[PDB]
Amino acid sequence: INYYKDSASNAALQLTIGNSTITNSVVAYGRWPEFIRDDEANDQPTEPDVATCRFYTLDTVMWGKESKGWWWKLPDALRDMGLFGQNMYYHYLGRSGYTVHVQCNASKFHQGALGVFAIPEYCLAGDSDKQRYTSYANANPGEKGGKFYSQFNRDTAVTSPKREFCPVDYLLGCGVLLGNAFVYPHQIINLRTNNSATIVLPYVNAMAIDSMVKHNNWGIAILPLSPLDFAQESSVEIPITVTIAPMCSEFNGLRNVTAPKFQ
C-alpha cells in the first residue's frame, strides 16, 4: 500500500522530392519524419512545402589511400542553401527531418568499403588541455565539413590557441571504439556490391522544437573501413558526393534576421 501522496515516493529506383530526383534505404529507428501534432506545442508556424524540402548537393570530396574520414553537422551544413537558410535565420525556432544520399562510383577492379553513420547529439573532443574551450566558428565549419586524424595532436600554442576539434578515427572523435559505432543508424558502401547509400533521419531532440543556430541535431560521419586500392597503382583517388533533402520543416518566431560571425 502506498502511503505518500506523491508518485515519486512510490517504491519502484528513383526518389523524387520537390523539384529534385535521384536515380535499399534505411529509416532511422523505424520512424518517418512527421509534423508537430496538435497535442504538443508552445503562434502560427510557417511550414514551407517545396521551397525548402528538396535535395541540395554539397561540395565533392576526394578519397585516396591516406584519407582517414570526414564529418558534417546538420542543420549546420545547410545554413546557406536557398530559402531554407533564410527561414532558419529569420525564425527563432525550427524543426526538420532529413534524407541523406551518399554517392561514390568505381569500377569492378577497385576495392574498398565506406561506413556512413548518423549520430544524434554528436559531440567531438577538443585539442587542448582546457575543457570545452572550442569556439563557435570552429564547431560549425559549414558545407566544407571536417576531417579525422589517426593521432591526438595537442595544441602547443599558449598566446593564440586554435580552439579546434581533434577527432581520432579509431575513437570516433568522442572516446568510444569505432567498432560499436554500428549501434547508431548506419550504412555500408562496398565497391564490389553497391555504389550509393541512403538514410532517412527523423527529428530527434528532448524538445518538440528548438533553435537551429545554436544547436545541431545530427552528425554525419564517413570513414574508410577498408583502404582504397586499384590494380597495382601507387596512387588512387575517387570522388565522394553528399546530397541532403530537408523534410517536414517547421519554423516559428519571425523577427529580424540573424547574422552570425563566422571568422
Binding site: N19, S20, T21, T23, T57, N105, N195
Partner: protein, 60 residues
Amino acid sequence: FCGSMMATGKILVAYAPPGAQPPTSRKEAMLGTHVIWDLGLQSSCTMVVPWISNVTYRQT
C-alpha cells in the same frame, strides 16, 4: 550514352526558368529542375521540361 560496358559515371541535367543569370556552375544549376543520371545502370536518360509561362502561348 555510347561508351563501353565497363565505363561508369554520374551526370546532372538541369533546366532553369528564365529571369536570373544563366547557370555557370553545378551549385547554381542544382537549384533548378534537375535529374541525376547513372551511366552504369542505364545507358539512356529522359528529362521532361514542363510548361511554365506567364503567357498562354509563346512566339516561335
